[PDB]
Amino acid sequence: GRQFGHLTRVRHVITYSLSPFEQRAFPHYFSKGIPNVLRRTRACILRVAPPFVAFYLVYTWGTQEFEKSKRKNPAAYENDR
């Protein structure tokens, strides 16, 4: 109903925070962040890539398969007859 008032009931939690001025926009964003980028990227790339392979394969597979099938009329039947 009333959005902030009545949602849940919660007791004996404590919270701490600072003025945004009190702290920095990039607390080692570069150094400390780069590992975090890496670690989780693999958890996905396990389950992400495998299909993308398949298309590109088939993509070229059919591409070639398409090409010679079309490209060369005197391929199987050459122009002796």
Binding site: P51, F52, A54, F55, V58, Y59, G62, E65, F66, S69, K70
Partner: peptide
């Protein structure tokens, strides 16, 4: 599933020769 669509996209982007 994601790929199956994108294939068709390129497939529909193909003339209707026999592999397609």
């Amino acid at each position: 599933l994601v790929a199956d669509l994108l294939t068709l996209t390129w497939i529909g982007g193909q003339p209707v020769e026999h592999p397609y």
